[PDB]
Structure 1
Amino acid sequence: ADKELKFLVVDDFSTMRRIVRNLLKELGFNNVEEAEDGVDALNKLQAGGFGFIISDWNMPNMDGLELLKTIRADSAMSALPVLMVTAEAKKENIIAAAQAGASGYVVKPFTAATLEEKLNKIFEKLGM
């Protein structure tokens, strides 16, 4: 994984975005942009050059599942890695995301070490 991979962090909580950005920083990933909800994220993804999306499951207007399905359906972004974030792991949520193409799932709060492990797992799973 290129340390310069461009990340999109999506969460309706500013503070949760700041945590994720700070965690990534710690790992050496400084290339991060932020979005507030699914539609905000799609707007930004339009400009191109993103490499990895970290999205919250629970967001207004367009939730994580919807954003993920829209990414998967788009010819230009369909392969982008998507890491889903939830405050509470639920079997049907996990199955629904997997089936929709999520690259992985992480329960918050999480440390830099957990994030790293999730990141490496996906890079490994996707041969990146």
Structure 2
Amino acid sequence: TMAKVLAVDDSISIRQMVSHTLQDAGYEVETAADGREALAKAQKARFDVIISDVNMPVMTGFEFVKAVRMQSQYKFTPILMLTTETSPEKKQEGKAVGATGWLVKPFNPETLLKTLQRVL
């Protein structure tokens, strides 16, 4: 079809980069600036994958994924979290609340594309 993506980051450049890169790759992309706006969008549709920054406004990315995992329709949905941390020990919180995998910032298009590809 064209996998449906919800990307959440308060950074304008991050949203534009993700949106442009994924859309050029055949994805249907929807962006949000914070956890509140993201949750509201996720609640109203059915995204195939969610990409979310850990340092989101309104709530941490951890609380966001946790709230997302609380909705039955998103129990198995792959979630990819953006972080500046390369150290696994530093974000065990991610696996705990239900994150599927990570994407370390700063990344590039190929990193983004391959990483997404590998969690679907």
TM-score, reference length from structure 2: 0.89
Residue correspondences, number: 120
| Mapped partners of 1:14, 1:69: distance in 2 | 24
Task: Point out where structure 2 has 5 or more consecutive residues left out of the alignment.
Answer: none
- Identical-pair percentage: 40
Poorly superposed stretches of 4+, deviation over 4 Å:
none
Task: Point out where structure 1 has 5 or more consecutive residues left out of the alignment.
Answer: 124-128
Equivalent residues in 2 for 1:1-128 (5 A)?
Answer: 2=1, 4-29=2-27, 31-123=28-120
Deviation at 1:76, TM superposition (A): 2.1
Task: Report the 3-state secondary structure (helix = DSSP H, G, I; strand = E; otherwise coil) of the residue aligned with 1:46.
Answer: helix
The code of the aligned residue for 1:27 comes to: A
| Mapped partners of 2:118, 2:29: distance in 1 | 20
Deviation at 1:49, TM superposition (A): 2.4
Contact 1:51 1:81 in 2 (8 A): yes
Deviation at 1:6, TM superposition (A): 1.3
Task: Report the 3-state secondary structure (helix = DSSP H, G, I; strand = E; otherwise coil) of the residue aligned with 2:30.
Answer: strand
Deviation at 1:87, TM superposition (A): 2.1
TM-score, reference length from structure 1: 0.84
Task: Report the 3-state secondary structure (helix = DSSP H, G, I; strand = E; otherwise coil) of the residue aligned with 1:19.
Answer: helix
| Mapped partners of 2:59, 2:87: distance in 1 | 20
Task: Report the 3-state secondary structure (helix = DSSP H, G, I; strand = E; otherwise coil) of the residue aligned with 1:44.
Answer: helix
Contact 1:27 1:112 in 2 (8 A): no
